[PDB]
Design a protein around this ligand. Structure first.
Ligand SMILES: *[C@@H]1O[C@H](CO[C@@H]2O[C@@H](C)[C@@H](O)[C@@H](O)[C@@H]2O)[C@@H](O[C@@H]2O[C@H](CO)[C@@H](O)[C@H](O)[C@H]2NC(C)=O)[C@H](O)[C@H]1NC(C)=O
Ligand code: A1IJW
Ligand SMILES: *[C@@H]1O[C@H](CO)[C@@H](O[C@@H]2O[C@H](CO)[C@@H](O)[C@H](O)[C@H]2NC(C)=O)[C@H](O)[C@H]1NC(C)=O
Ligand code: NAG
Ligand code: CL
Ligand code: MG
Ligand code: ZN
Length: 609
């Protein structure tokens, strides 16, 4: 470790911890910057050499974290928890957690290499006869309504990404648990859960899911019916799980892309404004500037020049390999902040632009916190910020204000269309956002050994989402591996928490804004009072317990499903009424059912390609 980056000495009391924390800060930003810059260089340009450089940056990071971690322990192990400065305790608490820096050098190099090769496997996989995930497979899952085309993209992707990840994923799991066990955690999953600082976290989440499950079951039954009328009885079983490739999305995780097949009242205004965006010639640039302008309408910060100069806002045309999966980047120098997105001109992509910009906004607002506290109050708060604004943006009235929806209507049919569309996006995602980390928590705990990765993945997929793989799978397949966050080692339960929390946020901001109609017709655009209430959250970083931040924001100190249930209530009732009238079976009691192959599959793919 460079002499300038090493910890000096400090007294072993709270006054010394403060100076220790201050000293840490100046060197930490340098080390984080070097590591984020190296990750940037690799992910906007995947080469063997950028991976080597990123690996060396990561090793430096581990070195730094071991030296300051061990010094914090040496000086403050018996006492940090009794510090009266609460922010100080949080800082030390962080520094003293070593993670992968617990491993010996050789295992740290194994770990860093595994992260790099798992990433490269996922981001460079392709399906031949060659398509990329982004844009090619994405566009197909979204837009194609051909059974065989969808199947070829689904199977190709899962086979191409998942199969080779499996041996690496095994080795990564063992090394990750080895590292965090030295921090005191029974497994890495227990470390990830600790961020919520809640002893009844898992029971609380199960309780949430129980209240939400009936909305998902009724939405599932209604979409299953629409798919049945289009694909017929051979490929859709009105009492069985839905084939996992027909829902608009590679992971079936949100269903917005099939809205055009399930829209209840077609002669109402068309709420998918993609065609209008294209017709009007929108590009990436316009999308980010319109999101930006929402944030400044609230008197939040604009994106700085460095964001505009450095971001990657479209997939590069030189065909260099990039990680297309959208992401928001804090360089830790309080100046560089960027988004890396292979933006496509589509309505769901306008939301993803808002999603990523919500991360940027948090980073802008907390940049002056001590480095350890530049995080959301919990990970689910970071995930909710952009989605809350996107809730206002998607409303018909808002879209009318930004030229994206010429016709205006306010009737019970138009409401149902909008709430249904919103339900495809938000409700359909619930089981998937809940299940992913159940699977990974079982893998980290050893309950799911490698001999059951796929079995236990499809157990949970059918249990919660009521889908089934459209070709047979066995334990040579690693279908969890074909989802970004798994090889990328990004936790998922944050997105389940976010999907509840954002409705709590929306409710509170809309009330603060002075709005007084139906929750799902609220637009907080240009509300400077909503803006101020949101800014208090963002500015807090992780300096304070998330329960208390939440309580100051919305008036309650817990996750609560009531705001989501209230926003969706008109369509929740309507879906239940429609499924009753059609005689539907709620759920999938034919749990073993899987569709047949299409005749002449895959031989005839060239006919529909
Ligand atoms: C869209 O209409 C709703 C419903 O409007 C009320 O009832 C209708 C049948 C009609 O008689 C309207 O004139 C009524 O105002 C609006 O929601 C109401 O908004 C007012 C004030 O903003 C509020 O006091 C009422 O409680 C609301 N009713 C409900 C059911 O919440 C709504 O604001 C209109 N939305 C848009 C985008 O214009
Ligand atoms: C597209 C969105 N992409 C992520 C994201 O923004 O979360 C990216 C990659 C994973 C994390 N991420 C970040 O950018 C980030 C950086 C720092 C943070 N402190 C937190 C996140 C996504 O996966 N999403 C969006 C909601 C559903 C979920 C998904 O597509 O599965
Ligand atoms: C992507 O990364 C590669 C490194 O793997 C970059 O290659 C370097 O290119 C510059 C300019 O041509 C040279 O000065 C270096 O000597 C190259 N290094 C190696 C190891 O080849 C490449 O420039 C990057 N592409 C972009 C657009 O950033
Ligand atoms: C798993 O599936 C593939 C084909 O779908 C097959 O080649 C393989 O032998 C199957 N069985 C095992 C144990 O891998
Ligand atoms: Cl999380
Ligand atoms: Mg989508
Ligand atoms: Zn996010």
């Amino acid at each position: 470790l460079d002499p300038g980056l090493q910890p000096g000495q400090f007294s072993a009391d709270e006054a010394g911890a403060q100076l220790f924390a201050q000293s840490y800060q100046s060197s930490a930003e340098q080390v984080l910057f070097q590591s984020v810059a190296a990750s940037w260089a690799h992910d906007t340009n995947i080469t063997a050499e950028n991976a080597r450089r990123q690996e060396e940056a990561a090793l430096l990071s581990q070195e730094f974290a071991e030296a300051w971690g061990q010094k914090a322990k040496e000086l403050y192990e018996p006492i940090w928890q009794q510090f009266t400065d609460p922010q100080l305790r949080r800082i030390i608490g962080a520094v003293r957690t070593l993670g992968s820096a617990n491993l010996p050098l050789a295992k740290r190099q194994q770990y860093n290499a595994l992260l790099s090769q798992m990433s490269r496997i996922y981001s460079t996989a392709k399906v031949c006869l060659c398509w990329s995930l982004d844009p090619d497979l994405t566009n197909i899952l979204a837009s194609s309504r051909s059974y065989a085309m969808l199947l070829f993209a689904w199977e190709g992707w899962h086979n191409a990404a998942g199969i080779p990840l499996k041996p690496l994923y095994e080795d990564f799991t063992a090394l990750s648990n080895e590292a965090y066990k030295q921090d005191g955690f029974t497994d890495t999953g227990a470390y990830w859960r600790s961020w919520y600082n809640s002893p009844t976290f898992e029971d609380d989440l199960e309780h949430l899911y129980q209240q939400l499950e009936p909305l998902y079951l009724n939405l599932h039954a209604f979409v299953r019916r629409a798919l049945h009328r289009r694909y017929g009885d051979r490929y859709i079983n009105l009492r069985g799980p839905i084939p996992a490739h027909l829902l608009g999305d590679m992971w079936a995780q949100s269903w917005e892309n099939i809205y055009d097949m399930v829209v209840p009242f077609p002669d109402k205004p068309n709420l998918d404004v993609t065609s209008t965006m294209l017709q009007q010639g929108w590009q990436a640039t316009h999308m980010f500037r319109v999101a930006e302008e929402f944030f400044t309408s609230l008197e939040l910060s604009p994106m700085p020049p460095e964001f505009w100069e450095g971001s990657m806002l479209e997939k590069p045309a030189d065909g260099r390999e990039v990680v297309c999966h959208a992401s928001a980047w804090d360089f830790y120098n309080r100046k560089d902040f960027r988004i890396k997105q292979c933006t496509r001109v589509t309505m769901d992509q306008l939301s993803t632009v808002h999603h990523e910009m919500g991360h940027i906004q948090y980073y802008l607002q907390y940049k002056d916190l001590p480095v350890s506290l530049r995080r959301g109050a919990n990970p689910g708060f970071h995930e909710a910020i952009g989605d809350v604004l996107a809730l206002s943006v998607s409303t018909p009235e808002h879209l009318h204000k930004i030229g994206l929806l010429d016709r205006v209507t306010n009737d019970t049919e138009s409401d149902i269309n909008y709430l249904l569309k919103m339900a495809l996006e938000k409700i359909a995602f619930l089981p998937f956002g809940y299940l992913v980390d159940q699977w990974r928590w079982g893998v980290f705990s050893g309950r799911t050994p490698p001999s059951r990765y796929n079995f236990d993945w499809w157990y949970l997929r059918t249990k919660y989402q009521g889908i089934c793989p459209p070709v047979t799978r066995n334990e040579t397949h690693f279908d969890a591996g074909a989802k970004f966050h798994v090889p990328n080692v990004t936790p998922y339960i944050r997105y389940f928490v976010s999907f509840v929390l954002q409705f709590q946020f929306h409710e509170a901001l809309c009330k603060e804004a002075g709005y007084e109609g139906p929750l799902h017709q609220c637009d907080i655009y240009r509300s400077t009072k909503a803006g101020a209430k949101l800014r208090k959250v963002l500015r807090a970083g992780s300096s304070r317990p998330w329960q208390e931040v939440l309580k100051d924001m919305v008036g309650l100190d817990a996750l609560d499903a009531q705001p989501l249930l209230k926003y969706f209530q008109l369509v929740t009732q309507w879906l239940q009424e429609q499924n009753q009238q059609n005689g539907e079976v709620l759920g999938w009691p034919e749990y073993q059912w899987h569709p047949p192959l299409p005749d002449n599959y895959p031989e005839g793919i060239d006919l529909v390609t």
